[PDB]
Amino acid sequence: VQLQQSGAELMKPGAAVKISCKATGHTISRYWIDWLKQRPGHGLEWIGEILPGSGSTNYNEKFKGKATFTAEKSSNTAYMQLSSLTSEDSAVYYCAMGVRGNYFDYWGQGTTLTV
Amino acid sequence: RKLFIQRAKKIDKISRIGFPMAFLIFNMFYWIIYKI
Amino acid sequence: ANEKGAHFHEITTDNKLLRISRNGNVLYSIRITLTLACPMDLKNFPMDVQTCIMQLESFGYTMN
Ligand SMILES: CCCCCCCCCCCC
Numbered sequence: 001v002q003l004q005q006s007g008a009e010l011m012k013p014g015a016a017v018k019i020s021c022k023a024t025g026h027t028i029s030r031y032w033i034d035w036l037k038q039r040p041g042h043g044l045e046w047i048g049e050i051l052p053g054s055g056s057t058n059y060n061e062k063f064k065g066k067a068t069f070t071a072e073k074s075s076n077t078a079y080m081q082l083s084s085l086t087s088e089d090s091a092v093y094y095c096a097m098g099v100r101g102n103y104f105d106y107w108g109q110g111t112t113l114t115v
Numbered sequence: 116r117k118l119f120i121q122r123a124k125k126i127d128k129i130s131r132i133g134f135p136m137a138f139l140i141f142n143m144f145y146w147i148i149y150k151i
Numbered sequence: 152a153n154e155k156g157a158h159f160h161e162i163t164t165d166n167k168l169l170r171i172s173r174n175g176n177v178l179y180s181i182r183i184t185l186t187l188a189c190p191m192d193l194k195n196f197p198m199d200v201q202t203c204i205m206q207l208e209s210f211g212y213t214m215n
């Protein structure tokens with residue numbers, strides 16, 4: 001199983017970027033896709049989770065409204081669209097995945113967000 | 116005429132020798148494929 | 152997960168087995184007749200090779 005993201009994104013403050021997690025190896029509507037934020041200085045941080053087939057999501061209380069999860073079965077990819085981009089959103093956004101538990105054993109390469 | 120009838124003989128003499136061959140060459144080609 | 156019909160056996164007694172070791176290790180053997188469903192691929196029918204599966208899945212408990 002593998003998770004291919006998109007390249008880095010340089011977005012202006014106040015805009016909104018949409019990050020993609022291309023699942024090459026399994027149907028995207030099969031497992032829960034997770035999203036994590038790693039800003040330097042701090043540690044990692046769990047954004048939320050989405051099941052790309054049932055449209056179900058679970059956002060962290062700190063990221064409610066900030067991030068919005070979608071999916072597209074035609075391409076096997078789960079999107080995370082960050083709105084109201086600020087300089088605080090300068091971090092790396094991974095799309096992990098836990099198959100046999102709430103741990104994260106399948107990761108993406110990471111997508112840097114420069115704002 | 117009667118010479119024209121000879122084509123009516125070879126029209127069956129060719130089948131009598133070639134038609135069962137066309138089923139034998141198929142029979143070799145059928146099992147080689149679906150045995151894989 | 153693909154049982155498609157199942158029933159315990161209850162002939163002269165419920166066909167259940169229980170064996171509790173001294174440290175708590177429980178054993179549990181029950182006799183079950185299943186009618187599991189396996190989707191068959193008949194692309195080469197008389198000479199096909201099937202693969203029928205059974206899935207022992209939990210229902211009301213998550214993986215924690
Ligand atoms: C002159 C006509 C010759 C007839 C040839 C018949 C060959 C048939 C072989 C293919 C059968 C499917």
Ligand SMILES: CCCCCCCCC
Nearest residue numbers: 129132133134136137140
């Ligand atoms: C005159 C002999 C005819 C043989 C035809 C063989 C056709 C093989 C498909």
Ligand SMILES: CCCCCCCC
Nearest residue numbers: 142143144146147150
């Ligand atoms: C009936 C004739 C069969 C010959 C081909 C056998 C190939 C396995």
Ligand SMILES: CCCCCCCC
Nearest residue numbers: 141144145146148149
């Ligand atoms: C001419 C006979 C062809 C047999 C192979 C068919 C494969 C789909």
Ligand SMILES: CCCCCCC
Nearest residue numbers: 131132133134135136
């Ligand atoms: C003289 C040709 C005879 C063909 C017999 C094939 C079964």
